[PDB]
Design a protein around this nucleic acid. Structure first.
Lengths: 77, 102, 89, 46, 63
RNA sequence: UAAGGUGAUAUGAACCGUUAUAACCGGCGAUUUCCGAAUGGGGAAACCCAGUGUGUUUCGACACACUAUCAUUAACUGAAUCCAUAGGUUAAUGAGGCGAACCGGGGGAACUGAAACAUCUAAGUACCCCGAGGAAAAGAAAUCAACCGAGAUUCCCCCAGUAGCGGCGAGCGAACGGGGAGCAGCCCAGAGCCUGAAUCAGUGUGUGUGUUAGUGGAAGCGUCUGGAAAGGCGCGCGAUACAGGGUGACAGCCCCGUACACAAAAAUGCACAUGCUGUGAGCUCGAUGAGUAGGGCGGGACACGUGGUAUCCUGUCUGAAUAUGGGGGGACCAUCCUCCAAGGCUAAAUACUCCUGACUGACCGAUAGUGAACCAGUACCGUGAGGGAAAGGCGAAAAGAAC
RNA sequence: AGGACCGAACCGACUAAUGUUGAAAAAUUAGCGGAUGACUUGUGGCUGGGGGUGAAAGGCCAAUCAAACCGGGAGAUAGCU
RNA sequence: CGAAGGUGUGCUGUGAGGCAUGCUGGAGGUAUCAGAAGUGCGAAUGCUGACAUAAGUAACGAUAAAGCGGGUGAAAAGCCCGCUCGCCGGAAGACCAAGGGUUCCUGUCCAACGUUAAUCGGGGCAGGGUGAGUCGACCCCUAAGGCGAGGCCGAAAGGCGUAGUCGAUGGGAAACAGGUUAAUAUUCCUGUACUUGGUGUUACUGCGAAGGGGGGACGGAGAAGGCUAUGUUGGCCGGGCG
RNA sequence: UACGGUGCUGAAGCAACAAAUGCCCUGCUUCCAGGAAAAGCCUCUAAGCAUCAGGUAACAUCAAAUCGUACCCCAAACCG
């Protein structure tokens, strides 16, 4: 669905409050983006569906670490 | 665990025929016995053709309860309560109020 | 084998009726009430095993027992199969 | 005058049958309510 | 028959006596549906004997 | 246990046993058609058609086994593309649906009150969905307190309709602290001493205690009434039993029971001891959880509606220090106080009854009580989801009216 | 040849009468319009509740339609009888 | 040697009420003083049941039409039989699908059902009856459309969809005539046939598919030809002469 | 003769004419609005097979299972 595959950002719900504080139910959607990554360990290009915060996690720790944690969650990469 | 059994000789205690005595023909599942010569009921038998055809007013022996009858002690001259003692390995009946096994 | 047990199990009753007696005197065909599944070949094998006779063909039919009423209780009767077996002369 | 129930067993068993209920989630919910209340004829499967 | 009397028996004889019981069963239900058999009760006990034999067919052979 | 049985309306005919494999009861087995998660494909549920291999063929066919889909592992393979993956096959292991209520999470109303109504209330309630257990959640301080100190969580009585929140309206409503119930602490982020060391899951053996069949079980007679005595009159007896049910009217002494004393071949619940399989025990030392805390924007939760509003959670955009350090003490600042987040495990006290047994009732007695005391979710109505009744009593016994 | 003509089947429903606790919760009788098409019909599908469908009346959606039916919030609320 | 309940009668209190008692009934009721209440009905277009009124009133369901004799029986306008009359005849006839499910036939019955009677019936009760290589289903193939491994998408539920797999209302091979029972007949019997598979035997030889190609394979209107179903007349045969 | 009917015996069994909406016609002619799909059937080879296996014809034998069949079907039996 609309799930960050690295970080797990489920689309949450919320109240939309206008200037007169009239509540209307709305949905918060993450900044999901499909990305093609390069791993020199597999030496190829993988396809993930991540968010920008997830992209910064890919920047900070190694992609070989995030891939093994994704395999620890038993997910698909 | 039944106190009165089939070929006993009993007396009734509550009934129009109180004090009279007879042999037991049958013990039914309801908790009723059939005693010979004691309960007499006039059945108006409607005869069916494809069988023996009496017609008439016939006589049968109806039922009275197990609680009403009592085992005649046949030595004392009146009734007695009966219990279950353990004589040699079969559990047996015995007359109460004197040490007598039936 | 249970095949022998099957052919011993199939045949239930010989059938007695007016159309039964008419077909029996006319074309030497007996009428039998059989089991529920009781196919053609199993019926023919069972009569040729058990009555020790000759058989040409067998005509099968399934008949529905009538929906009777007893007091207020409706009861649909059993559902049995009848087979006309045409013996040889 | 042409009444509203002009019956046929094919549309009847295709719409309200057993398997058309069992293939659907809310159909299985309907059958579970019908069993919990305890009706004799469950659906029109006949 | 009585249970130990079938416990001592052997399996091929168990099968032949099964088939003899079934043939006996067939003759009885044919005579019963014809109008014979004053004694109907025979039929019932015959069925029970078949059951007893088949019970040993699942125990004298193997569970 | 057993001298009586073949379930009931519902009698019969035919037989079984009576001193013991007639019946009834209890543990464990065997069989368990077809549909049904339905599992070989399909489908209008209770049906249609298969295939692979075995071994029986009287040569026309038989009977049994397996064959779904996914997750995980393993092994043969294995493309564009050399490699190597994707993919494919086979096997093994697990999952699947049903169920009354409780619990946790994901979503989430409006009628209604405000004597209109939009903020608010109703209410995170109804309902939908997911998941698990006999309970579940939480849970071992980056906690409260006040310069005094306590020690995880949960639940009940107070505090308290109190401080507060609020078109400051309707309403919502704490905590600190006190008294109880119950008590429990841990391990990884790591190395050398250690390898059956203080435990716990799973096996057997041993004892006891319960459960699933059961056994013994006290003590009385006469007379009048009456259809019948259990009533009245008279005279006795039992009671670790006078709870109760029946018997031809109300029975402690007529029957079944009750108090009481027992009883297991077999199978299992519970704790206890005794052994296997895994597991480390405990020291000396180093470490102590990063796109994280905090922030800017927009929401949500704490009693707290953005308010002067701390705290937690976050969708988005950022971004530390890392014990010479960091949080919290209800804007905020300095000093004091106490604790060490960004990793987890954990019994009991707690809410529940689809169901099993006993026992109780200033609860009902056929228009009441469950809708249903009776063959009731039935008859009937509706395409359907769904709706849904009416209906007890002869007598002590059918002796149910021969003729 | 014809969204041609007259006219049965078939599809409708313009007029009058009888019906109104009917024979019938929409009819019958005597007339009437179309009748080779923008027709009619048998079978089997599909679209659904603030939605479907509509040669458009707010018409039809199981005799119910300016928002179906069934269960549930719910014993809504009622300054009214 | 007679409780509650039912039904009268007589005394009694200011009132709700009470007390005594005849008869029916046939086994329960309960003083006094306290206690708890599902505690008191004439109305709610109240609810359920029973019964009234209109009332022995309207009506008896098409204006196709009945009449007589004989039968059966306790009873005949309605049933069976006969003879006339009358109605439909592009149906009010003969078969089917769909839809019902025993309503079909025989014996027996008339309490309920039949807008009356009923000996009758689609009613009660018992018994009997549905025979398939060729008709139809199932089976092969597909349309609209449904489901749909992977897949894509979606807070969950799930949505769509590829391979496939289902889906006749369509495409695929096969049988006719006559006879017969009360109830079945293109199914049973008589006569004459045809299809599609299997195995083996004989003779000639390349077969092999899921791939290719043809074929299946298709609109409306019009008009004419050839024919037949079928009908009329004449002949032929049988009977008649009223 | 149950009195309904069973069983027996059976002559002719041609011609002309009329003729359809039925068959040739899943034709012919014309018109624009341009008029289903796959299989059984016929044929062609691919991998593979190659004494064979198959295939063709002939002959013999066997099989064709299972389910529905009664009755109404413009109605007293279907929906009202």
């Amino acid at each position: 669905s609309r799930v960050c595959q690295v970080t797990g950002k489920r689309p949450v719900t919320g109240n939309n409050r206008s200037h007169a504080l009239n509540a209307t139910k709305r949905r918060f959607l993450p900044n999901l983006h499909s990305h093609r990554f390069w791993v020199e360990s597999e030496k190829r290009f993988v396809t993930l569906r991540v968010s920008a915060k997830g992209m910064r996690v890919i920047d900070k720790k190694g992609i070989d670490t995030v891939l093994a944690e994704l395999r620890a969650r038993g997910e698909k990469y | 665990a039944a106190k009165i059994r089939r070929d006993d000789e009993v007396i009734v205690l509550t009934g129009k025929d109180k004090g009279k005595r007879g042999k037991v023909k049958n013990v039914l599942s309801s908790g009723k016995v059939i005693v010979e010569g004691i309960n007499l009921v006039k059945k108006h038998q409607k005869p069916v053709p494809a069988l023996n055809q009496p017609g008439g007013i016939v006589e049968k022996e109806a039922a009275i309860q197990v609680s009403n009858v009592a085992i005649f002690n046949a030595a004392t001259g009146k009734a007695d309560r009966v219990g279950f003692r353990f004589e040699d390995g079969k559990k047996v009946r015995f007359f109460k109020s004197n040490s007598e096994t039936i | 084998m249970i095949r022998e047990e099957r052919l011993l199990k199939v045949l239930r009753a010989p059938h007695v009726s007016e159309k039964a007696s008419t077909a029996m005197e006319k074309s030497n065909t007996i009428v039998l009430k059989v089991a529920k599944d009781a196919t053609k070949a199993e019926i023919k094998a069972a009569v040729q095993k058990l009555f020790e006779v000759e058989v040409e063909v067998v005509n099968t039919l399934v008949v529905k027992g009538k929906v009777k009423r007893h007091g207020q209780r409706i009861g649909r009767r059993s559902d049995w199969k009848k087979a006309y077996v045409t013996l040889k002369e | 005058m042409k009444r509203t129930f002009q019956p046929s067993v094919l549309k009847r068993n295709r719409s309200h049958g057993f398997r058309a209920r069992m293939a659907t989630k809310n159909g299985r919910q309907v059958l579970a309510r019908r069993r919990a209340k305890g009706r004799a004829r469950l659906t029109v499967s006949k | 028959m009585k249970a130990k009397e079938l416990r001592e028996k052997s399996v091929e004889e168990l099968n032949t006596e099964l088939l003899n019981l079934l043939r006996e069963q067939f003759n009885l239900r044919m005579q019963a549906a014809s109008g014979q058999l004053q004694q109907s009760h025979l039929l019932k006990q015959v069925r029970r004997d078949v059951a007893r034999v088949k019970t040993l067919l699942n125990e004298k052979a193997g569970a």
